[PDB]
Amino acid sequence: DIQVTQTPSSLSASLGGKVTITCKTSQDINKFIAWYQHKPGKGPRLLIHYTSTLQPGIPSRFSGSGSGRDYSFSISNLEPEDIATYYCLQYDNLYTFGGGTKLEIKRADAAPTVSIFPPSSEQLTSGGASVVCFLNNFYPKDINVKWKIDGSERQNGVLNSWTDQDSKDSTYSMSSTLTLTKDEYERHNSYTCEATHKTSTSPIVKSFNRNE
Amino acid sequence: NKITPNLAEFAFSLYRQLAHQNSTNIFFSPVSIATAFAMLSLGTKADTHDEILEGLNFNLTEIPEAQIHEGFQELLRTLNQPDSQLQLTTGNGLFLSEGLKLVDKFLEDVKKLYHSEAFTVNFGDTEEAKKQINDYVEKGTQGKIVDLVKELDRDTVFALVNYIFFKGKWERPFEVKDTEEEDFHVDQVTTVKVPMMKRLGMFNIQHCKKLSSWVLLMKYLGNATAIFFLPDEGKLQHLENELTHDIITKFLENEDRRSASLHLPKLSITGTYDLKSVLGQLGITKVFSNGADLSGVTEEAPLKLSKAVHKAVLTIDEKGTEAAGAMFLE
Amino acid sequence: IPPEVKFNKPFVFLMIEQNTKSPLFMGKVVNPTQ
Amino acid sequence: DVQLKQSGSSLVQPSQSLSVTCTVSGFSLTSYGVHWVRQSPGKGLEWLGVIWSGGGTDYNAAFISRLSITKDNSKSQVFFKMNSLQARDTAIYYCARDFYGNYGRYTMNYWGQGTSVTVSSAKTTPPSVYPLAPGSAANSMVTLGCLVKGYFPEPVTVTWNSGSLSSGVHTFPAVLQSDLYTLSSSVTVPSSTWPSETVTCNVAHPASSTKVDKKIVPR
C-alpha cells in the first residue's frame, strides 16, 4: 500500500552530463530503497540497495542518497551504455516500484523529412484505403501530425507509431496512417499530412491529389 | 570430471594432516575447502598462486589453470543440478568492503567460473556485517551451520565463503524400533554404550586386502553413496595410509550384494578447524604471509589472508544422512 | 548364517556424489558419544 | 549458480486464467522467497506478490482477489496463477528472488528470463503486404515503404532487398487495428537508384509460415 512517486518520468540528458531522479514515498521507508537499471530484452539489474550502497562492479558514475520519505539517484558522466529506464523500489513494507524514468540522449535539433503515400491498388481491392505519412529523423521527439482531406481536418481512423531513439544518429521517426473505406476515399480528392515541429514556425506540408 | 582425482587426493592429504594431530572425531568437506581456495587463486599471482593450486594436489604442468577452473565450474554446476530425491546445494559468496578498489577481471572470473554471488559489506558495522555473512551460510546450510562468524575485524577488506548442504535418504533405511544401546570400543580396554542401528539385509560389502578392511557401500536415493571402512584389528593406520582415488573407484564399480547383519551407530558430529597451519604443511604458506600477492583482487594496497576456518556438521540416523560444511577465508 | 558386520570401533567414511564421483565429505569416527 | 527459469510464453483468452512456473536451482526454496513482477507495454515494473521461504504469501492489494502463488519445495518449483485476464493484462511476467538488503530486509535480484503473455481471442492470421510508392507527381533521395496489415500474432520481420538496403530503413512498432497488428517500414535510397533499380520489401510471418516479396513499382 506504500505509494512511490518517481520523477521525472522521462529525461533527455547530454553525453557526459549528470542526471538526477527523485523518489518520494507516502511514508517513512527507513532507507530501504533500491535502484534498478532496465534495458529491453534484459533482466532488471540491481545498482544500489539501502539508499546508497552500490553493488560490486557498478561504476562510480552511479550514486544514491536520502532518508525518511525523500530519496534521490544520480548518474554522473552519462555514457551511451547508461541509456536505459531506471526504477526505484521501496522494500521497507512489502514492495513498490516507482513509475520509472526513461533516459534518452540529447542532440541537436533536426527537422523531419516528410513523405506521403496514396493507398495501394492492392489494398483497394479489399475495400479499404490506408494513406501513410512518414516523418523521419527528427529531434526532439515532440511532434504533431495533422491529416486534411479536401481542406478539412480528419482525426478518426488515424494510427501513429514512433520508433525508439535511432542507434545511428539518435533521432526519432514516426509513421502516421489514416485508414478509410474505399468508398470514403474515392469521395474526396486532396489528401494532406501536416507536420508541426519546433524546428520551424511553419508546418511541413505534403499532399497528393487522387485524380492526378 | 578431470579434477575429481585431484579432489580425492586432496581429501586424503588433508585427512592425513588432521589425523596426525591426540585422537578426535574428524569430519570435513574436501569439496568446500578446495572450491574456496581455487576461487581465491583467481586473485593471486606467481608463487602465491602456484602454492595454492599445488596444495590442492594439482600439477600445473599436467593440467593448466584454465582447465582447473573449468573443472570447478562444471563440478559445481553438476552438484547443483536438479534432483528430486537428494538435496544437494553449494554456493560461493564474495563479501567486499565498500570502496575496495576491486579488479574487475577478478569479479568477472569468480562469477563465471565459481558461480559466486557478490555483496557490498560495511565491515565497520560489525554486527550487520556478521549478520549478513552468517545469514548467507545459515540459509545455504538450511539451518545447520548457525552463527559461523563470531568476531570479525572492523578493518576487514573482504571475506570469501563457500557452503555445501547435503540431505539424503537411505535407499534401504533402518527401523527405529531395531536401534539398541550397544558397546562401542573406543579402545582395546574401554567401551561406551551408543545407539546402534541394526538391519539384517542385502548389503554391498567387500573385504579389501590392500586396505585390510571391510568396505560397505550404503546407497542414498538419488546420486550419492556413502562408503564405510572398517579396519581389521590393528590396521586403522594401514587403512589410512593406503587410501587412494584408484582404490575408491574400484569399490564403486562393484555392484554385488550379500546377506549380512549390519550394526551402524547413529552419529552427530560437529567440528571447527583452523586450517592455516595444516594447509601450510601442504605447502600453502605465502598467501598467509606479508609477501602474499593478491594483486588480482586489488592493486590499491597489499593484502593477505589471516584466517581459514572450516566448520562441518553431520547427522546419521535411521532415515539417512544430513551434512553441511562452510569454508571462511579472510 | 549371515556375517555380523559391526561398526563398533573406530572407522573411516566418505560421501561421494554419483555423477562427479567427487568426495563431498570425509570423516573418522573414534567415539560416537560426541 | 543461482538460477530462476520460467515456462514458455503463453497466449491467454480473455476472461481465462494464466499459469506460469518458475523452476529454481542453486539454492533451496525453504531458504529464500520468490517474487512475481510484470511489465505491461509502455508501463513500468509492477510487483504482484511473493511466496516466503516458510510458505506464507503476500500480494499487491489491487490483485488480492485475482492472484495465487504456491510452490513445491521438493521440486524447486514456484507456481503463479492469475484469473479473469483481460486485454490490459498483456505483459511480460517475471519471477525474482530475495536478495540481502540489510537489517533483515530483502530486495529483489536474480530475475527469471520473463514469460511474455498476450491476452487476446485472435486467431493466427497472415498479413497483407501493400507497396507504398510516391504519387504520380512528387530530389536527391526518394523514400518508399511497405504496409504490413492485419496479422496475428507478433512478430513479422521486414527487410529490403533481402537486407542489402540496411542503411536508410525505419521499421515502426506494430499497433493493434481491428484486434490484429499493423506495422509499416520505410526505406530511403538515392533517386538515381529508383525506379531504375528494383526495390523490394521482404516480409516474413513465422507463425503462419508465410514469406511475401513485394516489389515497389512506380505509379
Author numbering:
A (entry chain L): 1 to 212
B (entry chain A): 24 to 44, 46 to 354
C (entry chain B): 360 to 393
D (entry chain H): 1 to 82, 82A, 82B, 82C, 83 to 100, 100A, 100B, 100C, ...
Describing publication, verbatim:
AAT is a 52-kDa glycosylated serpin normally found at concentrations of 1 to 2 g/liter in human plasma, where its role is to protect tissue from damage by neutrophil-derived serine proteases, particularly neutrophil elastase. As with other serpins, AAT presents a bait sequence on an exposed structural element known as the reactive center loop (RCL). However, with AAT, this step is interrupted by a structural rearrangement in which its RCL becomes inserted as an additional sixth strand within its central β-sheet A. This insertion is rapid enough that the hydrolysis of the ester bond does not occur, irreversibly trapping AAT and neutrophil elastase in a covalent complex. The E342K “Z” variant of α-1-antitrypsin (AAT) undergoes oligomeric self-assembly into polymer chains that are associated with liver and lung pathologies in AAT deficiency.
Additionally, they expose a cryptic epitope absent in native and denaturant-treated material that is recognized by the 2C1 monoclonal antibody (mAb2C1). The Fab fragment of mAb2C1 was incubated with Glu-C–cleaved AAT, the complex was isolated by size exclusion chromatography, and crystallization trials yielded a crystal that diffracted to 1.84 Å.The solved structure revealed the epitope to be defined by helix E, helix F, the upper portion of helix D, and β-strands 1A and 2A. This is a site intimately associated with the transition between the five- and six-stranded β-sheet A configurations of AAT; upon RCL insertion, this region is displaced as a fragment with respect to the rest of the molecule, with compensatory rotation of helix F and loss of surface-accessible cavities. The 993-Å2 intermolecular interface between AAT and Fab2C1 involves 12 hydrogen bonds and 101 van der Waals contacts. Superposition of the native AAT molecule with the cleaved conformation within residues 97 to 167, delineated by the epitope, showed steric clashes with the N-termini of helices D and F and reduced contacts with β-strands 1A and 2A as the likely basis for selective antibody recognition of the inserted conformation. When compared with the crystal structure of the fully loop-inserted, protease-bound conformation, binding by Fab2C1 was confirmed to not have induced further changes in AAT. The recognition of heat-induced and liver-derived polymers by this antibody therefore indicates that, for both samples, helices D, E, and F and β-strands 1A and 2A are intact and properly folded, and in a configuration consistent with a six-stranded β-sheet A. The Glu-C protease is a useful tool by virtue of its lack of stable complex formation with AAT, which is the result of cleavage at the atypical P5-P4 site in the RCL. This produces a self-inserted RCL that is four residues shorter than seen with AAT cleaved by chymotrypsin and neutrophil elastase in the canonical P1-P1′ position.
